[PDB]
Amino acid sequence: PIEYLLFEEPTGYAVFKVKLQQDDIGSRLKEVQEQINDFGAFTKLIELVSFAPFKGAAEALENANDISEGLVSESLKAILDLNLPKASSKKKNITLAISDKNLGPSIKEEFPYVDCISNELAQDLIRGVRLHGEKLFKGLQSGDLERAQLGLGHAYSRAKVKFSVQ
Amino acid sequence: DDNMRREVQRDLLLIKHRAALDPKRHYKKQRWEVPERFAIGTIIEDKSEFYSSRMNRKERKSTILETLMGDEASNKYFKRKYNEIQEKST
Amino acid sequence: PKRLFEGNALIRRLVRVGVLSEDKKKLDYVLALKVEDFLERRLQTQVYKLGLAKSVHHARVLITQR
Amino acid sequence: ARGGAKVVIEPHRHAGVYIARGKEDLLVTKNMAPGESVYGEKRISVEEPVPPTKVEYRVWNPFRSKLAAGIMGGLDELFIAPGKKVLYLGAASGTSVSHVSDVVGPEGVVYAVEFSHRPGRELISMAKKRPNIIPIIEDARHPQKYRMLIGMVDCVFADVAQPDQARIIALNSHMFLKDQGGVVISIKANCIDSTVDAETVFAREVQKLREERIKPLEQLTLEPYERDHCIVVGRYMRSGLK
Amino acid sequence: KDNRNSRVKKRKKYQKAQKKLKSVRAVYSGGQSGVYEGEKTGIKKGLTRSVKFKN
Amino acid sequence: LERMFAKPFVGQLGYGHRDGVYAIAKNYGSLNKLATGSADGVIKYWNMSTREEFVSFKAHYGLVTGLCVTQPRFHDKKPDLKSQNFMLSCSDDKTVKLWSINVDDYSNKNNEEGLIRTFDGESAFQGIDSHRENSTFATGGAKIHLWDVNRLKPVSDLSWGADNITSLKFNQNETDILASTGSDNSIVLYDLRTNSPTQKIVQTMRTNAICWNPMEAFNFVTANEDHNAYYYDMRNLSRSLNVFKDHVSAVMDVDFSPTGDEIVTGSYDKSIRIYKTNHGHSREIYHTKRMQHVFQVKYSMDSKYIISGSDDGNVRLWRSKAWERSNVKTTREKNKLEYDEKLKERFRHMPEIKRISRHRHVPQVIKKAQEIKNIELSSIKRRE
Amino acid sequence: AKKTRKFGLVKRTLNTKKTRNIPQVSSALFFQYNQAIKPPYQVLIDTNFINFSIQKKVDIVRGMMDCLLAKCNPLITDCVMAELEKLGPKYRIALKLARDPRIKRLSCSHKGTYADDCLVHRVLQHKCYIVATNDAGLKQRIRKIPGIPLMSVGGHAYVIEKLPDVF
Amino acid sequence: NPKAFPLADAALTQQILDVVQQAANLRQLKKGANEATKTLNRGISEFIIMAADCEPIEILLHLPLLCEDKNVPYVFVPSRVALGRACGVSRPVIAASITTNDASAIKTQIYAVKDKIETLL
Ligand SMILES: [Zn+2]
Numbered sequence A: 001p002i003e004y005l006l007f008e009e010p011t012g013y014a015v016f017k018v019k020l021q022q023d024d025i026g027s028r029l030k031e032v033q034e035q036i037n038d039f040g041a042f043t044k045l046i047e048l049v050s051f052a053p054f055k056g057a058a059e060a061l062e063n064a065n066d067i068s069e070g071l072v073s074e075s076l077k078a079i080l081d082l083n084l085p086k087a088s089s090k091k092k093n094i095t096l097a098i099s100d101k102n103l104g105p106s107i108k109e110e111f112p113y114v115d116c117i118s119n120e121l122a123q124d125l126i127r128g129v130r131l132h133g134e135k136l137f138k139g140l141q142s143g144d145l146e147r148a149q150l151g152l153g154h155a156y157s158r159a160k161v162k163f164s165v166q
Numbered sequence B: 001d002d003n004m005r006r007e008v009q010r011d012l013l014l015i016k017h018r019a020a021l022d023p024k025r026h027y028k029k030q031r032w033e034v035p036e037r038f039a040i041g042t043i044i045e046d047k048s049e050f051y052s053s054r055m056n057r058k059e060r061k062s063t064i065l066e067t068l069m070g071d072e073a074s075n076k077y078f079k080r081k082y083n084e085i086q087e088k089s090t
Numbered sequence C: 001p002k003r004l005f006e007g008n009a010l011i012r013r014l015v016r017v018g019v020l021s022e023d024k025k026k027l028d029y030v031l032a033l034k035v036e037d038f039l040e041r042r043l044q045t046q047v048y049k050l051g052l053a054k055s056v057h058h059a060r061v062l063i064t065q066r
Numbered sequence D: 001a002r003g004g005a006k007v008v009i010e011p012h013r014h015a016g017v018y019i020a021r022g023k024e025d026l027l028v029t030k031n032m033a034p035g036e037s038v039y040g041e042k043r044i045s046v047e048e049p050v051p052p053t054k055v056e057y058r059v060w061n062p063f064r065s066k067l068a069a070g071i072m073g074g075l076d077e078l079f080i081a082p083g084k085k086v087l088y089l090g091a092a093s094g095t096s097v098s099h100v101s102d103v104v105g106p107e108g109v110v111y112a113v114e115f116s117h118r119p120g121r122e123l124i125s126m127a128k129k130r131p132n133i134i135p136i137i138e139d140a141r142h143p144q145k146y147r148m149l150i151g152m153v154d155c156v157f158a159d160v161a162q163p164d165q166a167r168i169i170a171l172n173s174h175m176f177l178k179d180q181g182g183v184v185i186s187i188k189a190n191c192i193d194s195t196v197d198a199e200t201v202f203a204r205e206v207q208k209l210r211e212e213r214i215k216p217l218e219q220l221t222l223e224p225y226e227r228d229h230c231i232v233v234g235r236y237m238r239s240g241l242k
Numbered sequence E: 001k002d003n004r005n006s007r008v009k010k011r012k013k014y015q016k017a018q019k020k021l022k023s024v025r026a027v028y029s030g031g032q033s034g035v036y037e038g039e040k041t042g043i044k045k046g047l048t049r050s051v052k053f054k055n
Numbered sequence F: 001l002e003r004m005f006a007k008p009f010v011g012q013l014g015y016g017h018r019d020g021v022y023a024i025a026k027n028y029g030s031l032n033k034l035a036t037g038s039a040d041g042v043i044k045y046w047n048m049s050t051r052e053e054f055v056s057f058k059a060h061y062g063l064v065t066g067l068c069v070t071q072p073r074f075h076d077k078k079p080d081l082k083s084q085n086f087m088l089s090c091s092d093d094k095t096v097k098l099w100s101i102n103v104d105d106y107s108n109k110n111n112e113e114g115l116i117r118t119f120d121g122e123s124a125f126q127g128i129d130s131h132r133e134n135s136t137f138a139t140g141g142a143k144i145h146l147w148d149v150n151r152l153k154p155v156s157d158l159s160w161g162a163d164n165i166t167s168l169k170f171n172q173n174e175t176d177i178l179a180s181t182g183s184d185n186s187i188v189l190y191d192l193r194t195n196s197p198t199q200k201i202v203q204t205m206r207t208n209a210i211c212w213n214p215m216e217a218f219n220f221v222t223a224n225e226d227h228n229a230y231y232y233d234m235r236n237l238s239r240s241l242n243v244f245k246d247h248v249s250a251v252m253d254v255d256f257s258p259t260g261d262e263i264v265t266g267s268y269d270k271s272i273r274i275y276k277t278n279h280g281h282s283r284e285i286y287h288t289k290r291m292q293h294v295f296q297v298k299y300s301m302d303s304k305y306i307i308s309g310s311d312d313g314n315v316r317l318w319r320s321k322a323w324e325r326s327n328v329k330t331t332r333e334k335n336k337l338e339y340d341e342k343l344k345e346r347f348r349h350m351p352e353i354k355r356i357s358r359h360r361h362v363p364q365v366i367k368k369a370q371e372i373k374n375i376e377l378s379s380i381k382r383r384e
Numbered sequence G: 001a002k003k004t005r006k007f008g009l010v011k012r013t014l015n016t017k018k019t020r021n022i023p024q025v026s027s028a029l030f031f032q033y034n035q036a037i038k039p040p041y042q043v044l045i046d047t048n049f050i051n052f053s054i055q056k057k058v059d060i061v062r063g064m065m066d067c068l069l070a071k072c073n074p075l076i077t078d079c080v081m082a083e084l085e086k087l088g089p090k091y092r093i094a095l096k097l098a099r100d101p102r103i104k105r106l107s108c109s110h111k112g113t114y115a116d117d118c119l120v121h122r123v124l125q126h127k128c129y130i131v132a133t134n135d136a137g138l139k140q141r142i143r144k145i146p147g148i149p150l151m152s153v154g155g156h157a158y159v160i161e162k163l164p165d166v167f
Numbered sequence H: 001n002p003k004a005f006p007l008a009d010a011a012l013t014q015q016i017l018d019v020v021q022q023a024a025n026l027r028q029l030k031k032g033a034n035e036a037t038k039t040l041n042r043g044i045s046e047f048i049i050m051a052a053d054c055e056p057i058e059i060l061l062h063l064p065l066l067c068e069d070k071n072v073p074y075v076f077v078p079s080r081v082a083l084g085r086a087c088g089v090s091r092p093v094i095a096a097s098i099t100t101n102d103a104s105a106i107k108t109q110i111y112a113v114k115d116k117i118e119t120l121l
Helices: A031-039 A039-045 A058-070 A074-085 A103-110 A121-139 A144-163 B005-016 B064-070 B073-090 C002-017 C025-032 C035-041 C043-050 C056-065 D066-073 D094-104 D118-129 D163-175 D199-212 E007-025 F331-346 F350-356 F366-382 G002-019 G046-054 G060-068 G078-087 G089-098 G115-125 G134-143 H011-024 H035-041 H063-070 H079-088 H107-120
Strands: A002-011 A012-020 A047-052 A093-098 A114-118 B042-043 D019-020 D027-030 D043-046 D053-059 D086-089 D109-113 D132-135 D151-157 D178-188 D214-220 D227-234 F009-012 F021-026 F033-038 F042-047 F051-057 F064-070 F086-093 F094-102 F117-120 F127-131 F136-140 F144-148 F156-157 F165-170 F177-182 F186-191 F196-201 F207-212 F219-224 F230-235 F240-244 F249-258 F262-267 F272-276 F282-285 F294-299 F305-310 F314-319 G043-044 G072-077 G104-106 G129-133 G152-153 G159-160 H029-031 H046-049 H074-077 H095-099
Touching: A002 A074, A002 A121, A012 A074, A012 F094, A031 A039, A031 A121, A039 A047, A039 A121, A039 H063, A047 A074, A047 A121, A047 C002, A058 A074, A058 A144, A074 A103, A093 A121, A103 A114, A121 D163, A121 H046, A144 D118, A144 D132, A144 F086, B005 B064, B042 F305, B042 G104, C002 C025, C035 C043, C043 C056, D019 D053, D019 G043, D027 D066, D066 D094, D066 D178, D066 D227, D086 D094, D086 D163, D094 D109, D094 D118, D094 G159, D109 E007, D118 D132, D118 H063, D151 D163, D151 F196, D163 D178, D163 D199, D178 D199, D199 D214, D199 D227, F021 F294, F033 F064, F033 F086, F042 F064, F042 F086, F051 F094, F064 F136, F086 F127, F127 F165, F136 F165, F165 F207, F230 F249, F230 F262, F230 F331, F262 F294, F262 F305, F262 G159, F272 F305, F331 F350, G043 G060, G043 G115, G046 G078, G046 G089, G046 G129, G046 G152, G046 H011, G060 G072, G060 G159, G072 G078, G072 G115, G115 G134, H011 H029, H011 H074, H011 H079, H011 H107, H029 H035, H035 H063, H035 H095, H046 H063, H046 H079, H046 H107, H074 H107
Parallel strands: A002 A093, A093 A114, D086 D109, D086 D151, D109 D132, D151 D178, F021 F064, F064 F127, F207 F249, F249 F294, G043 G072, G043 G129, G072 G104, G129 G152, H046 H074
Antiparallel strands: A002 A012, A012 A047, B042 D043, D019 D027, D027 D053, D043 D053, D178 D227, D214 D227, F009 F314, F021 F033, F033 F042, F042 F051, F064 F086, F086 F094, F094 F117, F127 F136, F136 F144, F144 F156, F165 F177, F177 F186, F186 F196, F207 F219, F219 F230, F219 F249, F230 F240, F249 F262, F262 F272, F272 F282, F294 F305, F305 F314, G152 G159, H029 H095, H046 H095
């Protein structure tokens, strides 16, 4: 019961709809771990649904800072509001797989009909998505992830340190 | 390649026989067959080691063999050792 | 009662000898003691450590030299 | 020794590093920003054949780089290659991350991770003179705090001294380390268990790796450079440790 | 004379054994003394002095 | 290919229990979670996805005789069903204890770890189960008591007469029907809406355990010490629907697959057997040199796996069908596999195929016991 | 190669004729001293050891305390545990012992279940343990290793062999 | 000011200054910013004590860089004149280095103070 997952990226947020569930007990087995590595089987387990790209470098930077501190940004708020179905706020909440335990509560207190998950299974799904990366986007236009990462890392670190031209 | 070939061959042979340049060094026992590639080069100090390790301008010789010549204690030790090894050969 | 009396005696004896540190006042650390600890407490070692001597044999000699 | 003698470069066994022979040998890596030495190390220059260009080398100082000491002692399978993306846990400054950069080359990247701010600042400077490094000044116990910035490294090298070293390594390897990945750990026994001794600390830490699903491959006690240190090379196996 | 005095014989024996140990396995002595002169004794490419975890 | 791909054993759960396993209870809600308990007195709450354990309480001074896993319905509050799970141990030293477990299933918060409540008893308790969707448990010691979570005194007394009661089980559907097994080798159905025992059958030997089935709601199956498992209809208790046969010592536990068509039994002989509800002979036998006296068996809520607690102290877990790897299968492969199964169901009874697909290797103790038992039955039959 | 050809060539021969890896020595070891085994010790238990202990009625933990006058942390590897298990029902008592809360278990990523091989590797690798047994073949191999103390069971209580500080 | 971040309280200052005087007596202590930096370069330092009211603070503030680069514990204490007394010299000292020597009598003290410094870091 892992209906959706959220994946943050240097160029914006992505949201995937889980199609099948890998069996929960067998997860430590050679066979399911290999299907996470392989690309053919990961597509059977996951299809992308949404992708909101960041506006510019500054907006990406502050968004990464808020992800670090564990808050929800305006952009994340919007994309979740758009993708996630509205179930009853009392029974049958919708399951979303995130990467950060500390991100959980903020998402909840913004969306009381969603339930975050960071399990062994959800961490495996995040890992597979991160491994395959751009092949999963079916061609949706994304910046070069590696250059994005270099720029973002440098900006993040300079921000924390207070690097100065003086 | 086959220019500067004589000088580079001398340097390579010297390095292969480096165990005998000094009575005080005693390197580990390795064969050192000549590599397929290499590129002899210069060592550059930092500005902060000008007395400790910076070498000179007039002691800068274009080859390890000729700087070995320029050093003097090496020269007298070599000529001595060669003298007695020759007298034992004879 | 026997354990308590005799054990406390043994621990304070070792602590005052200097073998055992203050913070390890427990019979378990007593079990963890060793020969190097006792030798480190000997006098010649202490001279050499405090610096009145230059070697352990210099120290030995001094001590017996009065 | 002195910065005049003439040396003979040569390839090492490990792709990416070189041996400089002479009256006495050295370990070297090709520079990437030729013309500057990041921490004052004597640095070789050769010529490469329009006028020929000058290619510049740098020297590993084994008493300063734990990886250098490991290389010089002799590690069978080092996992840092001339094209691979390496995560680096604990880069105080360029003293060894710059050399890992020089050995991964222009293709592979290197994610330097540090916690404090002063060496972080100089790490930023070096990392901006060098393209491969991306510097991250986040704590190394919170990969979720810097997960936007790293993707699927090939091997992690670890030089954190913290006692909870193996937990740190497990977190970061699970979260970013590709499968069948390389892990190199630098263990400092005094700074893990100050009371019990070094062989005990090593055996304990090796078992902790064997727990967190890294099959350790080899183990080296790097003596004549550092006192009571070790580096363990192991393989993240992630699926059937057996 | 190393039989006339006992502890002298043990002293000299210990010094000799210290040297032989320095031969058997690399021993830690201080660290770098001057500036990094270079590995005075030679780098061997194909030795691999490390303990391997067999299966 | 089936014979060369049958690889049942899939792995065990951590380092195990010190002193043999005697209580297992799967969480009927989730799928990772089970709770095991040992004659040491130490109960553990396993995460089977990672083969790890959440906690490990030293619960009781004596044996742990029963485990239930649940969520209570307190009236003081509503304990978080999402951050914590709850577990209920039923001990031999006259206590019942309710524990909390901190479960990582959701990531949706950020104290109160263990032993929420203790229910003192007057007797030694001997089995436990908990009526679902009502938070009401029932414990069989010397007289079965219907307890509520919020009252420390057993709410209701159910007992035919003055006999102790070995074991209990509620049923899955029409959930007010309880069945119980008593040591004057009796099987007694209880109903909770009228709040009374309902009927009684007495067999020739004691029945160790009973499981309703979760798809028919009036059939149950009892593991019985005369080497057998008897499958009964509830409304007509005069006769057994079927008898499941192929064990060679006391049967010790049974469980229904949630699909409702297969049964898994574990005996005091050291083996596991899997049956289909319609046949009456074993489909499959699981056995190891390191597993002994299977005392507890639980079939998994995805129907895919089997957990077996054995008194060598280990909680192994096996595949329900020894083939079906857990990976996801490309549609071509899936069609080929279903085609395989259909074809062999068609030709099941041809002599060559039957010889090959029935050849399964069994321990020498079971082989010899089986031929002896056959000899004795022939003897009985011809003197008759 | 005929016989006379071979003989002739042997005659003529007589007339005419008249990456590697060498593991580093452990930094713990003085020449054979092994100065890295200070109390509290760490003892790798073995199957033979458990069974002989049951035979001679010596407790594990208190027995090693007696033998060494220190604390002894005993450790059981996965191949030692699985060997006891396969031994089976007749050794139910040895297993209920070895599976004690104080016997901490250290795992392994190694093939099959041959505790001899598995043990000898541990002590080749680390040299902070002391091996416990009564098995002759393993005893011989461990003696061949330098500086590894060997605690056998014998007589009425455990004996220890290569510890300089047996007392 | 967080620039002198780890600043010892009264008790830790007591034990620090006591081991500083002990090391000055057994002559395992290097006194002064420059000599401290020299020991730091040579990697012979067990740990570093600094003053917290230097005029100004940066002149020794350079040290924490090398300290936490090479993993050598460092700690600030309130008064440089107190540090000078503790060292046993006629003039106020601002930064001193407790060196490392296996053949020392004060071994266990230095290790206790270094333990607590690391905990505080
Ligand atoms: Zn093993």
